[PDB]
Amino acid sequence: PNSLEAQIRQAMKTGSTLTIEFDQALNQKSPGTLNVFLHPANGGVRIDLDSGNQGEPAKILWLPWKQGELQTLQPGSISTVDMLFFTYYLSGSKVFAGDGGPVWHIDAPVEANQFWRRMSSDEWMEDWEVGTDRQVAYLHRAGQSDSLWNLSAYLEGAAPSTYGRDNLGQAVVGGIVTGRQQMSLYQYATTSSGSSAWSPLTYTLQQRKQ
């Protein structure tokens, strides 16, 4: 009926359920705009680089995961409207987003102090003054050693968003571009319970201490 590209946007907007399946090979592709092929999976969508298997061509914003490092999607890559944004599955991983800023994917075991340190060499961060603030979406698995995610030392604002429980659970993070340097981020959790529905990933207001 609707290209899969559209069915997905439908789920994100309304707040239905539609699981996403990623091929591990996507992690070989640097953050940026990427040509991928969507396939109908078992009550969701599969994303890989195979044209066969009733495949539908699409052009997304992609942010992979990389062991022992951060991966960053640059704001200047965010313009084409209704373009879909996806990051690899979150299973310990944190995701931090700036309103018209970059979007970082952090490997699970990276101490907050250490990733904050790396983030701040980025132009958008160097453009974020001690004493002033910005909008920030920030997701982290629930009940994980604070030193791995807690940014209270650097940011003053609403507490972070979370996925899972007792440091158990998977999350998926998607998005839809709504202009230049603007996109509406969504999410869904997978747990022993099963796969939850899509929902907004809000951006609260955070002030910068140091």
Binding site: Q28, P31, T72, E123, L168, Q170, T190, T191
Partner: protein
């Protein structure tokens, strides 16, 4: 430190045997250089001659001096136009490059500007409209901006340097880099320096270069730095299962991974741990790609607090975080050991691995530390997650 591996056998161990202009030599000696590094002895020459180069080099003043010297030697000084474009992944690095470039080119009359922006995106534009610097160094976003807005010109650019490419592609500049290259002339010399050499960096060299010169430093890309490795004397095989269950009573374990040498034992152990009331997911080599996709999602979600699997070697396990990892079956060699418990990347250097050692095991490998070439303490009677 790995071992140097070129496809260019020429080596020059003096700056005087490189046919550099006198003024450039003055700058090089005045800056304190006396004899070139391993990477300079191999890379500077193929650059001055104009060939595309790939150099696997750690960050430092010596690495920067490789492409700085090369660039300065090619500049046509009387041509008051930008002739070289260097991309770095941050404002900070870019500015350090400018410093180095200016110092060496000090006696030559070579101009070099840094596309930073900062608190001057309107001010610095007033200087670029006045003069086209010989060499421009900046970040990909900022450079691409200046090209689109016509404050920089690609017309006389014959030398294009990607510094810390692995970084830049981690920081999302792949698009901006691809876009900048599409604006440069066809015959443009590409020099690429990167400490790592993953798939997308290789892919870049394949698109931007022709029959390039490779200077690589092959070394293990997985390490045990930060992993706390332990071993338990189990005496005999039969008493492994009882030891494993006693670890669960002693230690706090969110999730765990257990490595096994054969499939027949993965299936044996999977059912025995079912019988002992454990949320377990099993994985082996005989499975398809779509099957393993399923048993991995179970584990990544929490449906299984335990993944028991076999050494894959070709396929890396899709595991992000785990309380610990258990060698229920000792790997047969250092490479397999490092695949199972070694981590990649510079950060999050932390883990726990426990190795089970039968008496037969000791006979076949005298000393575990020696056999795998790493520290492995006997497990204490304390608690380490």
């Amino acid at each position: 430190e790995g071992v140097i591996e070129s496809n260019w056998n020429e080596i020059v161990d003096s700056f005087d045997d490189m046919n550099l202009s006198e003024s450039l030599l003055r700058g090089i000696y005045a800056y304190g250089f006396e004899k070139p590094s391993a990477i300079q002895q191999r890379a500077i020459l193929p650059c001055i001659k104009g060939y595309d180069v790939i150099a696997q080099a750690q960050s430092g003043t010596g690495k920067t001096a490789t492409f700085a010297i090369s660039i300065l030697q090619q500049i046509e000084l009387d041509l008051k136009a930008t002739q070289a474009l260097v991309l770095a992944p941050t404002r900070e690095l870019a500015q350090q490059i400018q410093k180095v470039v200016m110092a060496l080119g000090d006696y030559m009359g070579a101009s070099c500007h840094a596309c930073i922006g900062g608190t001057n995106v309107r001010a610095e534009v007033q200087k670029l409209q006045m003069e086209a610097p010989h060499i421009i160094v900046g970040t990909p976003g900022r450079v691409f901006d200046m090209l689109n807005r016509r404050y920089l010109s690609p017309k006389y650019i014959k030398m294009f340097v990607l510094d810390e490419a692995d970084e830049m592609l981690s920081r999302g500049f792949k698009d901006q880099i691809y876009d900048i290259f599409q604006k440069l002339n066809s015959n443009t010399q590409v020099v690429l320096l990167s400490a790592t050499m993953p798939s997308d960096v290789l892919e870049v060299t394949k698109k931007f270069m022709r029959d390039p010169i490779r200077i690589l430093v092959k070394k293990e890309e997985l390490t045990l730095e930060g992993i706390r490795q332990f071993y338990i004397n189990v005496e005999r095989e039969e008493w492994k299962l009882d030891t494993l269950c006693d670890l669960y009573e002693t230690l706090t374990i969110t999730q765990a991974v257990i490595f096994i040498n054969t499939r027949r034992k993965v299936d044996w152990l999977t059912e025995k741990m079912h019988a002992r009331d454990f949320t377990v997911s099993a994985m082996h080599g005989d499975m398809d790609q779509k099957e393993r996709d399923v048993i991995m999602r179970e584990f990544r979600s929490g449906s299984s607090r335990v993944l028991i699997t076999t050494d894959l070697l070709a396929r890396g396990i899709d595991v992000q975080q785990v309380s610990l990892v258990i060698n229920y079956d000792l790997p047969t060699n250092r490479e397999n050991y490092i695949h199972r418990i070694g981590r990649g990347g510079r950060f999050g250097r932390k883990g726990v691995a426990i190795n089970m050692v039968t008496e037969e095991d000791k006979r076949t490998l005298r000393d575990i530390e020696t056999f795998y070439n790493t520290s492995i303490e006997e497990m204490p009677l304390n608690v380490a997650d």
